Amino acid sequence: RMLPRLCCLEKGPNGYGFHLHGEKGKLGQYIRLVEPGSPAEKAGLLAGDRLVEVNGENVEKETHQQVVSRIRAALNAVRLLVVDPETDEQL
């Protein structure tokens, strides 16, 4: 597949601008939606990204609330190590 990727977000006027949720059959958190014009978009985050680390801490087995709190408490910037979505399904 492809290597994990680091996205460095600078918090903006309304926050970071993305949403998290779990996935069917999986343990971790994934990006549900990236808001247009957001710091998340500017840093290259994509819907479907799997979160591996938040500010250098592994979050692969943490709960939705635990991951969200690590991000909400990062008041200025947050580093997200992610694995981009892949698929062989072309619609």
Side-chain angles (χ1 to χ4, degrees), residues 2-91:
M2 294 186 79
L3 302 170
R5 180 167 68 81
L6 191 64
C7 292
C8 301
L9 292 64
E10 181 188 332
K11 199 178 181 183
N14 292 164
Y16 291 116
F18 65 100
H19 303 276
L20 293 174
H21 71 161
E23 277 199 357
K24 180 170 296 302
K26 303 173 180 305
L27 295 182
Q29 292 293 298
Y30 298 68
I31 301 191
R32 181 188 183 181
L33 171 70
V34 172
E35 306 210 338
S38 68
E41 181 182 278
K42 299 304 177 182
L45 286 179
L46 299 176
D49 278 347
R50 178 171 75 80
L51 265 64
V52 185
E53 295 180 358
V54 173
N55 284 157
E57 298 298 292
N58 189 104
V59 294
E60 293 180 295
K61 301 192 292 186
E62 294 197 335
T63 67
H64 176 77
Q65 186 60 261
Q66 289 171 334
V67 180
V68 167
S69 291
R70 288 180 180 282
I71 293 158
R72 184 166 282 138
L75 308 190
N76 297 108
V78 68
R79 305 185 310 283
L80 305 173
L81 184 72
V82 304
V83 175
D84 291 304
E86 299 301 346
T87 182
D88 278 327
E89 196 164 69
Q90 179 190 46
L91 284 178

